[PDB]
Design a protein around this ligand. Structure first.
Ligand SMILES: CC(C)c1cnc(N2CC(CS(C)(=O)=O)C2)c2cnc(Nc3ccnc(N4CC[C@@H](O)[C@@](C)(F)C4)n3)cc12
Length: 312
């Protein structure tokens, strides 16, 4: 399932991102001289020689290769040299968090609630595969087209044994502001801690990209959760939507909704989106259609491919 490829059959055209994760490139698969040039995303390990960093990207690659679903990102391939490179699908509109921030004045209720369904469907798929993501957040949801998003970033994902309910984590830097209380306090992750993370993710979307608990330092979060403080109701949210969010943040993990329930409830809501999200000018808001998206690709591909001509 892990397809080990030759690095030399890949051309890096653009740096799409660089950070803790390393570097992500827009790249071309060119296996036969000039005949086929297929766009991929390439994530490259920076700390080539780090035993820990090598463990993290090889665990990521292992989990990401095991997943076949329309709302999750699969690993196409891996290159092993002095470093590791994950070959992944190019997602032309990048991550959903940057997207909702950049396109807020054109995002309608129908797109917001569809994303909620799509992320729940994907999380439900991962649950059925016995995967606890442990890092669900709007930054870890990528946009193939405005109408089609996929969960990614399996760097923290853990595969549970059959009928095993929880994963007990060691020490490490953890995304406190997206974690269930039991995860913060006791390092316990389940499908239900993923449901807490999903609640924060919906909250990120409904606020067009607000940072959770803005200003409050991570160290104060377990304390505010214990006092019953949760993320505020986003202005566009009717109480029915904010109630699903609040249910995802109940102290008792088993009282939190199930991804399969969240699919049924967000789906219901997406059939009458303007009843459940109140957005000004919702009726006259437009985003690139799937065909307009294929165009945008072709436009950007053209200018990128022209920059490879006035270079190399
Ligand atoms: C930084 C990542 C999330 C990223 C950013 N921007 C992209 N763009 C494509 C567009 C320019 S274009 C194509 O129109 O010329 C801006 C990204 C495109 N595709 C991806 N692909 C994937 C596919 C699957 N998984 C990941 N990951 C998961 C692991 C993380 O560490 C990650 C940062 F590598 C993203 N990335 C990412 C784009």
């Amino acid at each position: 399932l892990l397809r080990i490829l030759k690095e030399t059959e890949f051309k890096k055209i653009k740096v799409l991102g660089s950070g803790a994760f390393g570097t992500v490139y827009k790249g071309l698969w060119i296996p036969e001289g000039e005949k086929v040039k297929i766009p991929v995303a390439i994530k490259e390990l920076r700390e080539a020689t780090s035993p820990k960093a090598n463990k993290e990207i090889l665990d990521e690659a292992y989990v990401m290769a095991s997943v076949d679903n329309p709302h999750v990102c699969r690993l196409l391939g891996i290159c092993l040299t002095s470093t590791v490179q994950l070959i992944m699908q190019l997602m032309p509109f990048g991550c959903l968090l940057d997207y909702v921030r950049e396109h807020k004045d054109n995002i309608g209720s129908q797109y917001l609630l569809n994303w909620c369904v799509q992320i729940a469907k994907g999380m439900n798929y991962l649950e059925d595969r016995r995967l606890v993501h442990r890092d669900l957040a709007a930054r870890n949801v990528l946009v193939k087209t405005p109408q089609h998003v996929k969960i990614t970033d399996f760097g923290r994902a853990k595969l549970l044994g059959a009928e095993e309910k929880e994963y007990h984590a060691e020490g490490g830097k953890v995304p406190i502001k997206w974690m269930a209380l039991e995860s913060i306090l006791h390092r316990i992750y389940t499908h239900q801690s993923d449901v807490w993370s999903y609640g924060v993710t919906v909250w990120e979307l409904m606020t067009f990209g607000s940072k959770p608990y803005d200003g409050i330092p991570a160290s104060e979060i377990s304390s505010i959760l214990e006092k019953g403080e949760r993320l505020p109701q986003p202005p566009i949210c009717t109480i029915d939507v904010y109630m699903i969010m609040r249910k995802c943040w109940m102290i008792d993990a088993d009282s939190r909704p199930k991804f399969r329930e969240l699919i049924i409830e967000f789906s219901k809501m997406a059939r009458d989106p303007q009843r459940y999200l109140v957005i000004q000018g919702d009726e006259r808001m437009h985003l690139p259609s799937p065909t307009d998206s294929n165009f945008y690709r072709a436009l950007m591909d053209e200018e990128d491919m022209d920059d490879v001509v006035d270079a190399d």
